[PDB]
Each structure stands twice: as structure tokens, then as C-alpha cells.
Coordinates of C-alpha atoms in Angstrom, one line a residue:
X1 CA 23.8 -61.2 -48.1
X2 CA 22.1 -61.0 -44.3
X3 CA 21.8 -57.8 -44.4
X4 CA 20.5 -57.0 -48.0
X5 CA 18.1 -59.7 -46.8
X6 CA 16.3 -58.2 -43.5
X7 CA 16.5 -54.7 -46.0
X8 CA 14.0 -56.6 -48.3
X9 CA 12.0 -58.0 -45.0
X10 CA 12.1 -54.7 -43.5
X11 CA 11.0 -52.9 -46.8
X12 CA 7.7 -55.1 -47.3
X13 CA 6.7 -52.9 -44.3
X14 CA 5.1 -56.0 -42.4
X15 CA 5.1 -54.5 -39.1
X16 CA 1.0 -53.8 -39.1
X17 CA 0.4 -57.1 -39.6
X18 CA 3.1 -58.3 -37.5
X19 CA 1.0 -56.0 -34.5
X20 CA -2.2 -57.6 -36.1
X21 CA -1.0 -61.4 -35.3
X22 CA 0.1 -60.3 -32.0
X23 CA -3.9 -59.1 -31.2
X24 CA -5.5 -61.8 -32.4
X25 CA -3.0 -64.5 -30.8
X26 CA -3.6 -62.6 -27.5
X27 CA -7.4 -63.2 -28.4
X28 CA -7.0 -66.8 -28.7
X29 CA -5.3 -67.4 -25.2
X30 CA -7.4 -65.0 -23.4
X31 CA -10.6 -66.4 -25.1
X32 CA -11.4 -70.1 -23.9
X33 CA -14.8 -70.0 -25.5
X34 CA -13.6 -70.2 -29.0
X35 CA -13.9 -73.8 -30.3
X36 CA -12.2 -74.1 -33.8
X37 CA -8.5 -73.6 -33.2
X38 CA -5.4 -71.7 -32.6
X39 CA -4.0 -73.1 -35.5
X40 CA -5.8 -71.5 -38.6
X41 CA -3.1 -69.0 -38.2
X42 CA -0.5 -70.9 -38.2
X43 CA 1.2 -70.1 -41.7
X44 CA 1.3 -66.6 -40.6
X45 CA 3.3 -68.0 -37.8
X46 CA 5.5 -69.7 -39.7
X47 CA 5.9 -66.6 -42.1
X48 CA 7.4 -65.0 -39.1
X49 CA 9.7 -67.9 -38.5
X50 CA 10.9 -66.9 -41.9
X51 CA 11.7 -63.3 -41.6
X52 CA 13.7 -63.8 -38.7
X53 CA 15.9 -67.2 -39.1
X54 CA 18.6 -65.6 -40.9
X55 CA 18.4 -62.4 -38.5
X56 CA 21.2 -62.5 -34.9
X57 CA 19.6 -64.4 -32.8
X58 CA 21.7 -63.9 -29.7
X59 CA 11.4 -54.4 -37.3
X60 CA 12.7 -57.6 -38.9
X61 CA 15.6 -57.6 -36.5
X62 CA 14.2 -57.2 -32.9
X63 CA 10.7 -58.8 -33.3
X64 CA 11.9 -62.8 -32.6
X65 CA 12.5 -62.7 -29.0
X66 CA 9.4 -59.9 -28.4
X67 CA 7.1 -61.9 -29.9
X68 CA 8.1 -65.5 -28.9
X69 CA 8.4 -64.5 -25.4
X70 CA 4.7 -62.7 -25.5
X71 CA 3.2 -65.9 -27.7
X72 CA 5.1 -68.8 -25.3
X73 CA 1.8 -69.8 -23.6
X74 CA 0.1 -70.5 -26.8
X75 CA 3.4 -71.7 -28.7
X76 CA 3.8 -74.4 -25.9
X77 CA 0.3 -75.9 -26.9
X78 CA 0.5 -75.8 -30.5
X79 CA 4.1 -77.9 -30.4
X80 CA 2.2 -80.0 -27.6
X81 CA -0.6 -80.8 -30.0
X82 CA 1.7 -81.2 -32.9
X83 CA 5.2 -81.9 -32.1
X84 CA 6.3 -82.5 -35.8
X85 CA 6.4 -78.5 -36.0
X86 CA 10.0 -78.6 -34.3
X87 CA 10.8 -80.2 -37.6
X88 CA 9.3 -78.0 -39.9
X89 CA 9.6 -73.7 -39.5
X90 CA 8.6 -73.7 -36.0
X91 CA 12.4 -75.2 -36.1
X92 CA 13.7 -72.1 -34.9
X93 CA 12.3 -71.9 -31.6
X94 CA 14.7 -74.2 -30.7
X95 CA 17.4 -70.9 -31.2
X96 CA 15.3 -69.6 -27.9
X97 CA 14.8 -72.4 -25.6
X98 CA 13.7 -69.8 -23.6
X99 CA 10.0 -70.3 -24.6
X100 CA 9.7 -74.4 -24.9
X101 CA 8.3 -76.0 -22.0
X102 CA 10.5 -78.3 -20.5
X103 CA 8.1 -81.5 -21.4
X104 CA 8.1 -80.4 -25.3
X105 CA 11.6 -79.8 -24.7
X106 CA 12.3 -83.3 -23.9
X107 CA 10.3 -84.9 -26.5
X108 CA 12.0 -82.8 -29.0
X109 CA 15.5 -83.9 -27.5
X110 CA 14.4 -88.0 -27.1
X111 CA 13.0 -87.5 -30.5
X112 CA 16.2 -86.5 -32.1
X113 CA 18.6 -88.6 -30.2
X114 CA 16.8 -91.4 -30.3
X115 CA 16.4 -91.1 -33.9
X116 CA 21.4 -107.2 -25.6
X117 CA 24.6 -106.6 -23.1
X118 CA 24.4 -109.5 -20.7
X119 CA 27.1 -109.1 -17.5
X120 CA 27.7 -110.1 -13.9
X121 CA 29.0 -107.9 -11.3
X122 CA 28.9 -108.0 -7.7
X123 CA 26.2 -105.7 -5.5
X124 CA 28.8 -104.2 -3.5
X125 CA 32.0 -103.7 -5.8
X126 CA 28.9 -102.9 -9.1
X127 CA 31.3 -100.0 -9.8
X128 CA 34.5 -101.8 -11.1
X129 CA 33.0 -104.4 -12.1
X130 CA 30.8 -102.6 -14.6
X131 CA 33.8 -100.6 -15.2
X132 CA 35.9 -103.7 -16.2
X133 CA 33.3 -105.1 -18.4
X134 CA 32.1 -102.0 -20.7
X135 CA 34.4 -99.2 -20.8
X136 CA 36.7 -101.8 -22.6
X137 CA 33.5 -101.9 -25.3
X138 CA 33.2 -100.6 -28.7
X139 CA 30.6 -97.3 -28.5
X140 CA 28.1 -98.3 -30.5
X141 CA 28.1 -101.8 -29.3
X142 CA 27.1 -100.2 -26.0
X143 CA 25.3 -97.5 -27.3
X144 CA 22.6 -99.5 -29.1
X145 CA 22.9 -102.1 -26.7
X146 CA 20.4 -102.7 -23.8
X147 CA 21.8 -104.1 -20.2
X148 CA 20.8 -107.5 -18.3
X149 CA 22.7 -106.9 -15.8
X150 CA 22.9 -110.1 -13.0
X151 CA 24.2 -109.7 -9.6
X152 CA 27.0 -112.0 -8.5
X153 CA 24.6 -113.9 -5.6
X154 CA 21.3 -113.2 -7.0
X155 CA 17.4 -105.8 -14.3
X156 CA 18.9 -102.3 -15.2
X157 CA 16.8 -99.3 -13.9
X158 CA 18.1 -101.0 -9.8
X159 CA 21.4 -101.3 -11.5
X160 CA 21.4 -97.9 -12.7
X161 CA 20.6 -96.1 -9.1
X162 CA 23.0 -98.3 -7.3
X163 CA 26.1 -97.6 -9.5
X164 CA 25.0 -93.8 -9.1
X165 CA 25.2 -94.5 -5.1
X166 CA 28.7 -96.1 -5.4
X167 CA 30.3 -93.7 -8.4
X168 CA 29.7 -90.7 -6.7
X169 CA 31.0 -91.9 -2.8
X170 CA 34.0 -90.2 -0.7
X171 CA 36.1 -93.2 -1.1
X172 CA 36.8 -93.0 -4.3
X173 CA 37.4 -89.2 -4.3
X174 CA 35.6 -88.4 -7.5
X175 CA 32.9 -86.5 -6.1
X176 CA 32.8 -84.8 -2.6
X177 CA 30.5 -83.1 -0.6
X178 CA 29.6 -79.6 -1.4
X179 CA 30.1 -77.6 1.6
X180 CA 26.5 -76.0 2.9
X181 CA 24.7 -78.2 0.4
X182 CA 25.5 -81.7 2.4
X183 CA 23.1 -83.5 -0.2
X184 CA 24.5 -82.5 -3.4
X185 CA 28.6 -83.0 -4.4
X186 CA 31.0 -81.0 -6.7
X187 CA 34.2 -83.2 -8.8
X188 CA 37.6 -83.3 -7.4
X189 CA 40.3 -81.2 -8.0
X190 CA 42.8 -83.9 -6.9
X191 CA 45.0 -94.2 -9.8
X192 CA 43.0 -94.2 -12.9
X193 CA 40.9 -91.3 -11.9
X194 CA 40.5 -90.5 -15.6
X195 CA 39.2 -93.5 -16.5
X196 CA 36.8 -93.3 -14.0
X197 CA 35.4 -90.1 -14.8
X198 CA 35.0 -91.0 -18.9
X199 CA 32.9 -94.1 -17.3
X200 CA 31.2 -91.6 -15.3
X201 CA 30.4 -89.9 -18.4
X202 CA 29.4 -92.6 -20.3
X203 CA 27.0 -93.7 -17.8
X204 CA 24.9 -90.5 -17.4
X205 CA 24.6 -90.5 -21.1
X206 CA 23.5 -94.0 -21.2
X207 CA 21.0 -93.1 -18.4
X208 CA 19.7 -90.1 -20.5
X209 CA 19.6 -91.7 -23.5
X210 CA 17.5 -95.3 -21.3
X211 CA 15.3 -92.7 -19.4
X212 CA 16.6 -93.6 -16.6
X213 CA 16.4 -91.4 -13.6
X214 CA 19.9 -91.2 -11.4
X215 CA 19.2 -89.7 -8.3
X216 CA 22.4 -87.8 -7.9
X217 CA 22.5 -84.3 -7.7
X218 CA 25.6 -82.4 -9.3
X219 CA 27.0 -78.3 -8.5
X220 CA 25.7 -75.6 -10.8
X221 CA 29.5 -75.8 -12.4
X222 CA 29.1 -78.8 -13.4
X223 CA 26.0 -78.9 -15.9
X224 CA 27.2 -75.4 -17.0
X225 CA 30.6 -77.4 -18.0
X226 CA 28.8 -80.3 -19.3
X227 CA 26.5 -77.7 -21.6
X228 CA 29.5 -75.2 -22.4
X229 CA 27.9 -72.6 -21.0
X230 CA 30.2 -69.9 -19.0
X231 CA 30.9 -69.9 -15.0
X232 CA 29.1 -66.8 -12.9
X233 CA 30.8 -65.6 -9.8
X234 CA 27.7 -66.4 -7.8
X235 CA 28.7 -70.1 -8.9
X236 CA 31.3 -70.2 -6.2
X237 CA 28.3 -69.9 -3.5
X238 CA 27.2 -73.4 -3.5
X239 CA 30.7 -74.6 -2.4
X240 CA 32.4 -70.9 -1.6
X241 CA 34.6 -72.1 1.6
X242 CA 36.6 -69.9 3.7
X243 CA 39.3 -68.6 0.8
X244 CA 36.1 -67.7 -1.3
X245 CA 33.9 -66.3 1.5
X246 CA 37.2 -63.5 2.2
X247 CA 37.0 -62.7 -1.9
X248 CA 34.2 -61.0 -1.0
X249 CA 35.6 -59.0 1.9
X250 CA 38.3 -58.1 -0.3
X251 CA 35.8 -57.1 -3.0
X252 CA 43.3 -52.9 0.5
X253 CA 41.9 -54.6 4.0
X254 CA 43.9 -57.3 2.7
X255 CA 47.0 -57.2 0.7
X256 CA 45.8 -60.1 -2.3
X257 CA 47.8 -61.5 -4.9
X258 CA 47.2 -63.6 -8.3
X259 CA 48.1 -66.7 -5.7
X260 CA 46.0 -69.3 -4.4
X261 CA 47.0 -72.1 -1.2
X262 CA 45.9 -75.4 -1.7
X263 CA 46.7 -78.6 0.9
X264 CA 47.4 -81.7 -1.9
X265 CA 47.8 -85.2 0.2
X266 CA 49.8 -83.1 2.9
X267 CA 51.6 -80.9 0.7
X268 CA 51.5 -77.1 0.8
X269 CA 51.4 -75.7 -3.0
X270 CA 50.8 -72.5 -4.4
X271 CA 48.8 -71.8 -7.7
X272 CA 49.8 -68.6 -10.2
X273 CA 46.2 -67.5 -12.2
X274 CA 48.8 -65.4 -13.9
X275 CA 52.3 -64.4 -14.6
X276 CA 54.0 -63.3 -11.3
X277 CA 50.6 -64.3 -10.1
X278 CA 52.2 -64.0 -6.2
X279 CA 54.3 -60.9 -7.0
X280 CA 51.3 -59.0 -9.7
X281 CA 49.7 -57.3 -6.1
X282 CA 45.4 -57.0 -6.6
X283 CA 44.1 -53.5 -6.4
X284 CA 41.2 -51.7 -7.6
X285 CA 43.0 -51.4 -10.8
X286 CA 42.8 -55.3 -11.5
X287 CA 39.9 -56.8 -9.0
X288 CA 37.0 -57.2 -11.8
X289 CA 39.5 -59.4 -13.6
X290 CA 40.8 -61.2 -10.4
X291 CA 37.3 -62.1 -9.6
X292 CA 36.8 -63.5 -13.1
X293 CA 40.2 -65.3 -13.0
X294 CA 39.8 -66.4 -9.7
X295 CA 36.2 -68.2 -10.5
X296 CA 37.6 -69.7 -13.3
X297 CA 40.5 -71.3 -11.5
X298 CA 37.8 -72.4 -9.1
X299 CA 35.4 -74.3 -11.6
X300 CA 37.1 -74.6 -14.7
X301 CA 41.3 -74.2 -15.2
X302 CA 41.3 -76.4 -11.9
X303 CA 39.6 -79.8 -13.2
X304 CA 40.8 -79.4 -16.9
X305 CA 41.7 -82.8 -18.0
X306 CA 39.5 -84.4 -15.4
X307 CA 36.6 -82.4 -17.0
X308 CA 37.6 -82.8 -20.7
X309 CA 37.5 -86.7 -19.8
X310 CA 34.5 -86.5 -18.6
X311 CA 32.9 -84.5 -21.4
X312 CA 34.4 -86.6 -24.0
X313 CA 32.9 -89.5 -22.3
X314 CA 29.9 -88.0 -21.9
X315 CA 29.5 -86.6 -25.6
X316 CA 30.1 -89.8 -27.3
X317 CA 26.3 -90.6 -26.2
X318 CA 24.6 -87.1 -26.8
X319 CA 25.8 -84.5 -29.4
X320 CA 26.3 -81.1 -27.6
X321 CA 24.2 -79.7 -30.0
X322 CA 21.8 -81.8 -29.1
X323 CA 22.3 -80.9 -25.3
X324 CA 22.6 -77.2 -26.5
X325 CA 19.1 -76.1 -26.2
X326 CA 18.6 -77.3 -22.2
X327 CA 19.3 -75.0 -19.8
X328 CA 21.1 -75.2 -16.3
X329 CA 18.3 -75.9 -14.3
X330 CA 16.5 -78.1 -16.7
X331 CA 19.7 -80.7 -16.7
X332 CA 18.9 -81.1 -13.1
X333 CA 15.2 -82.3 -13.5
X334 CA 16.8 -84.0 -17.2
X335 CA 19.3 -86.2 -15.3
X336 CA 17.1 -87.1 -11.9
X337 CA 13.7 -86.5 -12.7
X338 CA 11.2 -84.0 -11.2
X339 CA 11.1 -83.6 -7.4
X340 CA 7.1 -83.9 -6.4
X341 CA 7.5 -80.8 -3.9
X342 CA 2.5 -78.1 1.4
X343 CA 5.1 -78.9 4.0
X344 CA 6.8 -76.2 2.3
X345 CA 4.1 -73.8 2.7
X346 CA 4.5 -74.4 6.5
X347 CA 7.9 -75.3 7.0
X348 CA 9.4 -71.3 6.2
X349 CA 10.8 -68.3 8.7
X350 CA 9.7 -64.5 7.2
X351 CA 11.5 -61.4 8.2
X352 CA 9.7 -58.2 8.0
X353 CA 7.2 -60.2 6.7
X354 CA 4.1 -62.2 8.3
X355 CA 2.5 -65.7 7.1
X356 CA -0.9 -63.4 6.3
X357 CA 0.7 -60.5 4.7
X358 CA -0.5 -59.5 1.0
X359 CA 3.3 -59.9 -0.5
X360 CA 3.5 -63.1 1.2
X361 CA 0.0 -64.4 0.7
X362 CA 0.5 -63.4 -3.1
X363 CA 3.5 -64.6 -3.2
X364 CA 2.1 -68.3 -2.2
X365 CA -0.9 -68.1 -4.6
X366 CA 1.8 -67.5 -7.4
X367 CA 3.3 -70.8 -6.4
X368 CA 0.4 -73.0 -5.8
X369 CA 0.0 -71.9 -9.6
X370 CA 2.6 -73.4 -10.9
X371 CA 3.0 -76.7 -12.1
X372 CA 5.5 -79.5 -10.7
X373 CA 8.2 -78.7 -13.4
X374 CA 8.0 -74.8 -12.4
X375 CA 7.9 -75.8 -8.7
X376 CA 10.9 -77.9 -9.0
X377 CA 13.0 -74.9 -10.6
X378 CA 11.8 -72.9 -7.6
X379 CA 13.1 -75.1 -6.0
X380 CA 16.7 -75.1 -7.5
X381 CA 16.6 -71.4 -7.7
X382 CA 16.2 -71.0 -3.8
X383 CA 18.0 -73.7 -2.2
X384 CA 20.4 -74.2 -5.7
X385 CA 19.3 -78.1 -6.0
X386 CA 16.3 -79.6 -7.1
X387 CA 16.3 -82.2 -4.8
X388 CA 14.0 -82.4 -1.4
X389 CA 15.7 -83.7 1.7
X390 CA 14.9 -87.7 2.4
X391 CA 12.6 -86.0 5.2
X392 CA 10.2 -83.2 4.8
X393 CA 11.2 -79.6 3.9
X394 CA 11.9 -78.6 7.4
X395 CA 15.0 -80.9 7.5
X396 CA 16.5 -78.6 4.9
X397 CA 20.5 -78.7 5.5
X398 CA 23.2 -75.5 5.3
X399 CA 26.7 -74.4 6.4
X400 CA 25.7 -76.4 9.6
X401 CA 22.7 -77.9 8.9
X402 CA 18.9 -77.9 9.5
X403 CA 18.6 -74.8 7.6
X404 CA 15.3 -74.1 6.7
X405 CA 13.8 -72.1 4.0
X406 CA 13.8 -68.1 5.1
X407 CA 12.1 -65.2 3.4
X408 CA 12.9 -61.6 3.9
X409 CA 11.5 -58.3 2.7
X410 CA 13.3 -56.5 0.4
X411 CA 13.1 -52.6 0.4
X412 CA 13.3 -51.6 -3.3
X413 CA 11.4 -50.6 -5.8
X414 CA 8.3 -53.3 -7.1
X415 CA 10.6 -53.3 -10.3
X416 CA 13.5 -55.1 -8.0
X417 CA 13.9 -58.6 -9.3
X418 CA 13.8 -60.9 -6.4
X419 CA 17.0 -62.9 -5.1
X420 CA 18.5 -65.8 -3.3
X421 CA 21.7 -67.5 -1.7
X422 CA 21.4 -70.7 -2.0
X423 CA 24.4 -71.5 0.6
X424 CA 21.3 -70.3 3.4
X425 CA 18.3 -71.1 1.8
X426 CA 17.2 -67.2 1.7
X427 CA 15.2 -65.8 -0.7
X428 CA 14.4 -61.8 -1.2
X429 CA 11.3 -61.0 -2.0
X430 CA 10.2 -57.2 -2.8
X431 CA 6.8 -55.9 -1.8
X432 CA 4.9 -55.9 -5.2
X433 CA 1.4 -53.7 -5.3
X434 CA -0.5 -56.8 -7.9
X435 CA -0.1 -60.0 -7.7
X436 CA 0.5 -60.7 -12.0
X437 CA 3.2 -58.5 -11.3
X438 CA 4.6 -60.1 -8.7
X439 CA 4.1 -63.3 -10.4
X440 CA 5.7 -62.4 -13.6
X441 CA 8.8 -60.7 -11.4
X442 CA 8.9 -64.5 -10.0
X443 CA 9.0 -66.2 -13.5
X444 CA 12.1 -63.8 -14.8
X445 CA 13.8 -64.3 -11.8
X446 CA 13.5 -68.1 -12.2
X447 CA 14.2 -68.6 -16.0
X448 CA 16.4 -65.5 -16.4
X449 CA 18.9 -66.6 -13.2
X450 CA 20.2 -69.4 -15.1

């Protein structure tokens, strides 16, 4: 029937027009004299949101993305000034979150989700305490319930940050440090652990669903996991140690198997990834799947029920296709709020590059044009967490700490997309002969990396 369908659509021959909307919109955001509106077109708009909802979103068939991507600046406002269009045809914008702003984004989301709980724990021991008392509790009951919480010696949001503080410590294992990123942690691959993590889950969710910002930072893995979305090899670079820092070596010097060593409570064990994992020998012949396998054993195969706990806890708050359209990095400022983000400017190292060079002096108008949401994703993309030290930027942490923000020249072509390691705080910048350019280079980079 699809197919029939765009036929029709393609046979009306709409493409002129189609070209015609895309001058005039152009118009419109180029032209700040213009008084009257943006939205007198906005049918013809909507008649494109109807030749292209049955197409693939993943001519009538390749015009969607082209357009939505050009028309995102103007888009943006429209939804800003009316948000009721997410409910009516501008609907399927939400199939490429690529174009929503994050703060119409968010609106959209509280909008659709959210379509008294007295207790009394102690300050220090909140954790169990809270555990005890709701995780026993119907969902709903807590779900459309609101806390007063009352501390055993003494009324939610302090509640809230404190039990964040306390899940996430050493001492109960759940969460531990992410080697070269001190502030941030990554889960546990080793009593009631489970338990722990679905009240972990439910938390968060309540938090999202109260506006309530924790200030916890989690790995990249993680919010992929919690949003379903798949696990990159690059993922491993946040909390790569000394097994995953050889895979790269590797990818004859070294004669690798299908095996992995791990040290459980004293305990040498060895982990297949697949049948005759230690005996199957890695070659050339099998290394782009031993990468793949060997990520996912990393992030995914190694935390299963740990992780499905936690998502089912999790989920019974927020639909996951509700939590669909966010992206990687926006979870980050979704979860925690925005970090502010000057210092910066000052606090950075250049190689082959000089504080009053043109790429570098473009480079920092391009920033000081973006907004705090934008910074803040700069942010995550170059140091992998959007999160500023307790101190100012040049307290920035690494491998072995007070590893501040580096920027080095890159030597390809002005089409090279810039790049970053997060585990050093290094970013890769190519020499860019205009500064749009170099600014629109920056944006892909940013959205497109995650």
C-alpha cells in the first residue's frame, strides 16, 4: 500500500513547489524586518508532513530529513510559539528529534507524561530507609503520589540530592568510579543488589517525572542502555582500563582469544564471548567482530540482569516511547539539569595552534554563539560529561588528574569533521578557511557524535 502511496505523491509532481516553500521559508529566517508571521504558510508545512509520514523514516521519499534539517531554525520557533503543533501534523517531527530544540523537546515530553507520601528516614542511612518504606508500594500509589519526606532528628527536592549522594557511593558497590573521569561513575559488574538497582530506577524516574534535578552524572553506556540505543566502540573510552587500552594495540603482536580475565572478590575467572571463546584464536579473519563482541561484553552481556532490573524499574515511571525521542547527550542535561559553563576560554593548552590564530579565534566566536544548552553538549562532547568540576575549568580531572582542556590542529582537509577523546580532554580541530563553515562542521560533530 506504501508504496502505491509515495507513487501517487510522487506523480502530483510537487517537487516545484516543494523548492518554492524551501525559498520563501529561507526568506522568512534570513528577513527580520517582516512583521506578520512565519506562520501563514503553515498548512503548506503541514502538507509536507503529510507526503512523508507514511514514507521510511530511518522526491516523496528523500525530502523529510533535507528539508527538516534546512527549516530546524524556523521549525524550533513555530513549535516554541505554538506547542500544540506536536499534537497535530507537525507530530512527525518527533520521528527526527534531530531538529527539536532540547527546551521544546522537554515540554513536548513533560506534556505527555504528565498527561501525599508522608515518611521518616534518617539523614545518614536516607537510602534504606527510603528503600524500606516505598519499593514495598503499589506503582501508582507512588507514582501519583508527592513526598513529605521528615528526617529522623529534624521537604523533597534536599531529599532527592542526598539520596542521589548516598545511592550512587563505593560502599554499596552499585556504582564506581569511572577510571579518567573521577567525577562521573559507571554500574557494577559484580545482597539484594537487584533490589537496589529497581529502586535506583524508580527514583530517577520519579525525579524526572518531579523535575527534580539529581546531580549525578552516569557513563555514555548507561543512558544508551536506558534509551535502547546500541553501544559504539569509542564507548569503552570513558572507562577503557588497561585490558581495553591493549584492544587497540591488537587492532598478531599478541596472540588474543575470545577470553576475557576478570578478579571477582579474590577469584580468578575467565569469560568465553563465544564457543571455544579461549581456544577460537583472533586474527584478521575475526577482529571486526571481536571488537563488536568484546564491547558488548563490556557494557551490555556483562550487567544483564542488573541492567534489565534497572530498566524495568526505571520504565514503570516513563514509557520508552516516551524516552525514545531524547538523545544521549540530552539525558545528561534531562536527568541533572544544564551546567551554566569564560574560565574556559582561558583555562585551555593549543598545539600547533596559538590563542590569536584565525581557526582558534573562530573557533571561540562559534562558541560564544551558542546558547547554554549548546554549550553544555560541548561540553559532554569534549570531556564526555556534562558536568563542570566543583572548581573552575582548570581543575579538570583525567587518567591522573588535573587534566585540562587541550586543543590540537588537525591536518586534513576543511571537510574533516572535528574529534575528541574524552579519557584526555582533547579535542581536534581542522583549520577551516570561514568561519559558518567551521561553525556548522562544529554543530554536526556535536549532534551527529551521539
Amino acid at each position: 500500500n506504501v508504496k502505491d502511496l509515495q507513487s501517487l505523491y510522487d506523480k502530483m509532481n510537487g517537487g516545484p513547489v516543494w523548492s518554492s516553500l524551501s525559498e520563501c521559508l529561507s526568506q522568512f529566517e534570513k528577513s527580520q524586518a517582516i512583521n506578520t508571521s512565519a506562520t501563514i504558510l503553515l498548512p503548506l508545512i503541514e502538507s509536507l508532513m503529510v507526503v512523508c509520514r507514511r514514507s521510511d523514516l530511518s522526491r516523496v521519499e528523500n525530502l523529510f530529513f533535507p528539508f527538516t534539517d534546512a527549516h530546524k531554525k524556523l521549525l524550533n520557533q513555530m513549535i516554541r510559539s505554538n506547542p500544540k503543533l506536536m499534537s497535530g501534523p507537525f507530530a512527525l517531527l518527533v520521528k527526527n528529534p534531530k531538529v527539536l530544540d532540547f527546551d521544546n523537546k522537554r515540554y513536548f515530553f513533560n506534556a505527555k507524561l504528565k498527561s501525599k507520601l508522608p515518611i521518616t528516614v534518617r539523614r545518614e542511612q536516607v537510602f534504606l530507609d527510603s528503600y524500606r518504606a516505598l519499593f514495598f508500594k503499589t506503582n501508582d500509589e507512588i507514582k501519583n503520589s508527592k513526598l513529605e519526606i521528615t528526617f529522623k532528628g529534624e521537604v523533597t527536592r534536599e531529599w532527592y540530592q542526598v539520596l542521589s549522594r548516598q545511592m550512587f557511593n563505593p560502599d554499596y558497590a552499585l556504582f564506581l568510579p569511572v577510571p579518567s573521569d573521577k567525577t562521573t561513575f559507571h554500574p557494577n559488574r559484580t545482597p539484594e543488589h537487584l533490589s537496589f538497582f529497581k529502586f535506583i530506577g524508580m527514583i530517577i524516574g520519579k525525579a524526572i517525572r518531579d523535575q527534580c534535578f539529581l546531580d549525578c552524572h552516569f557513563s555514555r553506556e548507561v543512558y544508551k542502555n536506558i534509551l535502547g540505543r546500541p553501544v559504539s566502540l569509542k564507548d569503552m573510552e570513558s572507562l577503557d582500563p588497561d585490558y581495553y587500552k591493549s584492544l587497540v594495540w591488537i587492532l598478531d603482536i599478541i596472540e588474543e582469544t575470545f577470553s576475557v580475565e576478570t578478579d571477582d572478590y579474590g577469584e580468578h575467572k575467565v569469560i568465553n564471548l563465544i564457543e571455544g571463546g579461549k581456544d577460537i584464536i583472533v586474527t584478521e579473519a575475526n577482529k571486526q567482530d571481536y571488537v563488536k563482541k568484546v564491547v558488548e561484553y563490556k557494557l551490555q552481556t556483562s550487567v544483564k540482569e542488573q541492567m534489565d532490573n534497572f530498566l524495568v524499574g526505571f520504565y514503570a515511571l516513563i514509557s520508552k516511547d516516551l524516552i525514545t525521542i531524547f538523545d544521549e547527550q540530552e539525558l545528561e542535561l534531562l536527568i541533572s539539569g544544564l551546567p551554566d559553563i569564560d574560565d574556559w576560554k582561558n583555562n585551555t593548552t593549543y598545539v600547533n595552534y596559538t590563542a590569536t590564530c584565525k581557526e582558534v579565534s573562530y573557533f571561540w566566536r562559534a562558541v560564544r554563539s551558542f546558547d547554554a544548552e549548546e554549550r553544555a553538549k560541548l561540553l559532554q562532547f569534549v570531556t564526555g560529561t556534562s558536568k563542570v568540576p566543583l572548581n573552575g575549568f582548570k581543575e579538570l580531572s583525567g587518567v591522573n588528574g588535573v587534566c585540562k582542556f587541550s586543543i590540537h590542529r588537525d591536518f586534513g582537509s576543511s571537510e574533516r569533521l572535528p574529534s575528541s577523546h574524552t579519557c584526555f580532554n582533547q579535542l581536534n580541530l581542522p583549520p577551516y578557511e570561514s568561519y559558518e563553515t567551521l561553525r556548522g562542521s562544529l554543530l554536526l560533530a556535536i549532534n551527529e557524535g551521539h
